[PDB]
Amino acid sequence: SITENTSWNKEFSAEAVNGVFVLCKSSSKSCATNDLARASKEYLPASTFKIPNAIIGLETGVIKNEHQVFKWDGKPRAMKQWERDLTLRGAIQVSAVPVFQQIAREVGEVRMQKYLKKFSYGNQNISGGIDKFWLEGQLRISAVNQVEFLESLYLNKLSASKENQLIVKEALVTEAAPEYLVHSKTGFSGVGTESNPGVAWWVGWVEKETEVYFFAFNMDIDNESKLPLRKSIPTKIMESEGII
Amino acid sequence: MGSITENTSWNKEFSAEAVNGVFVLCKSSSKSCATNDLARASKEYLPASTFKIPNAIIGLETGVIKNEHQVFKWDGKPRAMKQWERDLTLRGAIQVSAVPVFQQIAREVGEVRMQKYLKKFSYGNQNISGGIDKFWLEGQLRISAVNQVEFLESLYLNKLSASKENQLIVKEALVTEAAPEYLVHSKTGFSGVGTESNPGVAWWVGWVEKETEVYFFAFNMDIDNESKLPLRKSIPTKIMESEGIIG
State which residue of chain A sits closest to B167, comparing Cα positions. Answer: A163
**Cα B177 to Cα A174: distance, rounded to the nearest angstrom:** 9
* Catalytic residue flag (residue A189): no
Half-sphere exposure of B130 (CA within 13 A, CB side): 11
Q: Is A134 left (phi over 0), alpha (psi -120 to 50) or beta?
A: alpha
φ, ψ of residue A174 in degrees (nearest 5): -120, -15
Q: How distant is the Cα of A93 from the closest Cα of chain B, in angstroms?
A: 5
Q: Are strands B21-27 and B213-223 parallel, antiparallel or unpaired?
A: antiparallel
Q: Which of A27, A28, A47, A152 is catalytic?
A: A47
Q: Kindly provide the residue ranges of all beta strands, DSSP E only, lying in A152-222, ordered along the sequence.
A: 173-176, 180-188, 198-208, 211-221
A186 is in an annotated binding site: yes
Q: What is the enclosing helix (H) or strand (E) of B182? A: strand B182-190
Resolution in A: 1.6
Resolved by: X-ray
**Cα B38 to Cα B5: distance, rounded to the nearest angstrom:** 8
Of A187, A66, A50, residue with least CA distance to A121: A50
Q: What is the enclosing helix (H) or strand (E) of B95? A: helix B90-95
Q: How distant is the Cα of A33 from the closest Cα of chain B, in angstroms?
A: 27
- Host domain of residue B21: 1-247
CB A149 within 8 A of CB A48: no
Residue B168, helix vs strand vs coil: helix
Q: Are strands B200-210 and A19-25 parallel, antiparallel or unpaired?
A: unpaired
- Count the residues in chain A: 244
Residue A225, helix vs strand vs coil: helix
φ, ψ of residue B189 in degrees (nearest 5): -155, 150
Q: What is the enclosing helix (H) or strand (E) of A2? A: strand A2-4
**Cα B215 to Cα B1: distance, rounded to the nearest angstrom:** 12
**Cα A185 to Cα A93: distance, rounded to the nearest angstrom:** 8
What total of structural domains would you count in chain A?
A: 1
**Cα B38 to Cα B33: distance, rounded to the nearest angstrom:** 10
Task: Tell if the CB–CB gap between B178 and A178 is shorter than 8 Å.
Answer: no
Q: Are strands A19-25 and A211-221 parallel, antiparallel or unpaired?
A: antiparallel
Q: What are the CA-CA distances from residue B223 to residues B17, B18, B19, B158 (Å)?
A: 12, 11, 8, 33
Q: b/e map of A68-107 (b: 16 or more CB within 10 Å)?
A: bebeeeeeebeeeebbeebbbbbbbbbbbbbbbbebbeeb
Tell me B49's DSSP state: G
B190 is in an annotated binding site: yes
Of B179, B181, B29, residue with least CA distance to A90: B181
**Cα B109 to Cα B151: distance, rounded to the nearest angstrom:** 20
State which residue of chain B sits closest to A175, comparing Cα positions. Answer: B178
Question: For position A96, which CATH number holds?
Answer: 3.40.710.10
Q: b/e map of B73-108 (b: 16 or more CB within 10 Å)?
A: eeeeeebeeeebbeebbbbbbbbbbbbbbbbebbee
Q: Which of B9, B29, B49, B144 is catalytic?
A: B49
**Cα A230 to Cα B6: distance, rounded to the nearest angstrom:** 48
φ, ψ of residue B217 in degrees (nearest 5): -135, 155
